[PDB]
Design a protein around this ligand. Structure first.
Ligand code: UPG
Ligand code: UDP
Lengths: 362, 363
C-alpha cells in the first residue's frame, strides 16, 4: 500500500528533486499510496501525496539531519509503511537512490565529517540491507572501494528525461517567441548554462571562453546562466571581462524547454558532474552541447554526435578553441541538432522511473 | 522452443545486425520463440521477440562485456533455452556466427583489452570448446586454425545473405534517372559511393585522396557520396584540405541504399580491413562496378564475377589513384562490369544465408 519517500529538500529546479518526483508519480500510477518526509517542500503538492514537513531545526546541518531521522523514525514506528525509499544517505532505508557521488572518496582530496561518513556507511556497509539504485557507473567502484558493498545490491538505471523536454511539434514557434521576447536576432548566438551550482558547473570557465572568442563571434555571442545561486561573485568576473551587456544570470525557473529551443548552444564545462540531466535535455531539444568528459552523461553527446566533448585534463585554451570552432560552424551545429533529435527518437533516455519502480516494488 | 541470440549491439545499418535479424526471423517462422540479449537495441522490436537489454556499464568496454556475459548466464541459469547463438565471441555459445575476423592475427599484425578479447576468442575457437562456427569469410578460416588449431569439422561456411531489395529491379533505369535528377547529376557526371559506417577502416581517407588525384578532366566530373553514422568532421576537414568541398557529401545512415547503388557509377571501398564487405555484393547485384582492396573477404567475388577491379596488396595510394582513373575513363569497361555483375547475380548463391544458417542451428 504505502511507500515512504525521504529527501531533505523538495523544490522543482533540481535533478534529485525531479527524479524523486517522477519515481513517486510512477509508483502512484501503479496504485501505491505516497507519503513523503522532508525538511522543506517548495511548489505544488501533487494530488494524493501525503507530505510531512519535519518540525526540527538546528544551526548545524548535521545536527538538523540527526533530528530529522529521529523524527521520521518515530513517525514510521507509529505509522508503518511497506517500503522506505531515500534520496539522501541516512539509516533505515530499504532503497537508496544514489543521486550524490561517494562522500568518503571526495573527503580524501570531526563532527560534520563523522556525520556524513556514518550516514553513507549506514547505506553502503556490507551489514546494511539497503538496495542501491545507481545512475552513474563511475561511482559504483568508489562505493565498493571504501565500503566493500556486495555487488548484488547495486542496480544501474538509465536516464529519466521528462517528455516536456522533447522538442514539440511547434518547436519553431516556441523558438521564435522566445527569441522575440529576449530580443535576439538571427545572427545572435545564445549560450545557455543551466543548473544551480555555477562554480562546480564551470560558469567561470564558460565566461572566459566567451571573452576569448575572436572579435566577430565575440560581438554576436551572449550567455544566460540559470540557477538559484547568488550571482554576486560572477558579476565581478563579468565586469572585468567586459561582458556586462552580453551575460545575464537568472534565478531558477520552470520554463527550461523554451530556453533549450531558443538557444544556440548549451555549455557545460563542469569541474565534476555525477550525470548532468541538462546535457540530455539539450540533446532531446536538438540543442548542440559543449561538455567536459568528466560528466557522467557526456558520453551520450559523443555517441549521438550531438555536440563536442572536451577531453581531460581540462585546459582553458582547449575550451576557448572548441567554443570558437562550434560557433563558427553553422552547418555542424545544424547537423548536431538533427543528430540529437534522431538519437532522442530511439535511445533509452526516459525509462528511469519505470525501472526504479520495478526494483522498488519487486 | 526457445532460441537465445546474443549480440552486443543491434541497429538497422550494419551487416552483423542485418544478418542476425534475417536468421532470427527465419528461425521464428519455423515456430521457435526468439530471445535476444544485447547492450543496446535501436529500432522497433519485431512481434514475438523477447529483447533483454542488460543494465550494465563500465569505464572499460571490455569490463562491460564481462559483466554482460555474467548477466546473460545468470538469466540462462534461471530461464534455460534450447540453443544459444552468439554474433560476438564469448564463452557459453552453442553456435558462433563469425561476423568478425581473427583477433589474434590482427593483434600480431598484459594489456587488459588484448587479454579480454583474446580470451573470448579462445573461448569459442579452442579445440576443447564445443562451439559450432558459422563462417562467412573463408579467408579467415585458416587464420583461426593457425592460431587455435580449431577442428575443421566445427566450421560451416555459409553463402552470402544479400537481401532481395538490393537486386536491380525491372524499373532500374527509371530509379537511376530519378536519383540523378534529384542530386543534379548529368550524363557526364561520375558518382562514386562509399557505403557503410566505419569510414576510416573502410578507407574513405584513401577514396578522397584518389578522387583528388584524378586528372583534371576526370576530377572536375567526379563526385563522391559517403553514407554512414560516423562523425563526418575528420573527413570534412580532409575534403576542405583537398579542395573538394563542391564535390563530396557525407550523409548519415539511411534505408534507401538501393537507389544510390542504381544512381552511382562506381562503388569505392579501399578498406584497410574488412571481414567480408556486404556492400561489395550489393553493388554487384545492382550492376554497379566495384573498386575494392584485396584484403576484403568478399573481394574475390568481384574478380570471379568480373564486376570491377581488385587492388592487390600491399596498399599503395598511387596504385589506387591509377586504378580509379583507369576505371572512370573507360565507359565501355564499366558497361561490361555492370552486365557481368547482373549476370553473375542471376546464377550465384548470394541470398540463402539465413535458411542455411537456420538449418545448421536447428539441425
Ligand atoms: O532553473 C532550473 C534549473 C534546473 N532545472 C532542472 O533541474 C535538473 C538539473 O539536473 P542536472 O543537470 O543533473 O543537475 P544537478 O541537479 O546538479 O545534478 C547533479 O547533482 C545531483 C545531486 O543533487 C545528482 O543526482 C546528479 O547526478 C548530478 O549530475 C534538470 O531537469 C533541469 O532542467 C529546472 O527545471 N529549472
Ligand atoms: O546507411 C546505411 C549503411 C549501411 N547499410 C547496410 O548495412 C550493411 C553493411 O554491411 P557491410 O558488411 O558492408 O559492413 P559492416 O557492417 O560489416 O561494417 C549493408 O547491408 C548496407 O547496405 C544500410 O542499409 N544503410
Amino acid at each position: 500500500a504505502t511507500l515512504a519517500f525521504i529527501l531533505y529538500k523538495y523544490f522543482p529546479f533540481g535533478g534529485l528533486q525531479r527524479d524523486f518526483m517522477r519515481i513517486a508519480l510512477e509508483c502512484q500510477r501503479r496504485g501505491h499510496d505516497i507519503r513523503v518526509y522532508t525538511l522543506i517542500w517548495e511548489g505544488d503538492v501533487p494530488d494524493g501525496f501525503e507530505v510531512l514537513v519535519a518540525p526540527v531545526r538546528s544551526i548545524f546541518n548535521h545536527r538538523r539531519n540527526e533530528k530529522f531521522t529521529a523524527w521520521v523514525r518515530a513517525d514510521l514506528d507509529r505509522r508503518p509503511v511497506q517500503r522506505v525509499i531515500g534520496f539522501n544517505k541516512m539509516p533505515g532505508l530499504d532503497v537508496y537512490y544514489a543521486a550524490d557521488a561517494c562522500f568518503e572518496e571526495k573527503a580524501q582530496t570531526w563532527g560534520r565529517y563523522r556525520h556524513f561518513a556514518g550516514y553513507e556507511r549506514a547505506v553502503f556497509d556490507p551489514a546494511s540491507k539497503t538496495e542501491i539504485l545507481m545512475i552513474s557507473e563511475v561511482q559504483q567502484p568508489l562505493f565498493v572501494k571504501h565500503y566493500g558493498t556486495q555487488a548484488e545490491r547495486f542496480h544501474l538505471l538509465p536516464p529519466g528525461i521528462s517528455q516536456d523536454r522533447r522538442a514539440p511539434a511547434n518547436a519553431a514557434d516556441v523558438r521564435a517567441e522566445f527569441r522575440r521576447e529576449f530580443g535576439l536576432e538571427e545572427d545572435d548566438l545564445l549560450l545557455v548554462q543551466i543548473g544551480s551550482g555555477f562554480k562546480t558547473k564551470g560558469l567561470d570557465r564558460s565566461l572566459k571562453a566567451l571573452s576569448a572568442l575572436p572579435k566577430a563571434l565575440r560581438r554576436r555571442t551572449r550567455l544566460i546562466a540559470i540557477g538559484q545561486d547568488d550571482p554576486k561573485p560572477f558579476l565581478l568576473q563579468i565586469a572585468a571581462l567586459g561582458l556586462n551587456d552580453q551575460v545575464q544570470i537568472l534565478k531558477g525557473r520552470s520554463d527550461i524547454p523554451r530556453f533549450l529551443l531558443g538557444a544556440d548552444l548549451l555549455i557545460h564545462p563542469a569541474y565534476n558532474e555525477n550525470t548532468g540531466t541538462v546535457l540530455l535535455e539539450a540533446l532531446v531539444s536538438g540543442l548542440p552541447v559543449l561538455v567536459t568528459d568528466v560528466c557522467g552523461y557526456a558520453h551520450y553527446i559523443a555517441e549521438a554526435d550531438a555536440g563536442r566533448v572536451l577531453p581531460s585534463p581540462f585546459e582553458q585554451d582547449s575550451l576557448n578553441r572548441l567554443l570558437a570552432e562550434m560557433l563558427e560552424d553553422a552547418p555542424a551545429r545544424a547537423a548536431w541538432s538533427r543528430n540529437g533529435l534522431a538519437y532522442a527518437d530511439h535511445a533509452d533516455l526516459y525509462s528511469m522511473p519505470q525501472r526504479a519502480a520495478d526494483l522498488i516494488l519487486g
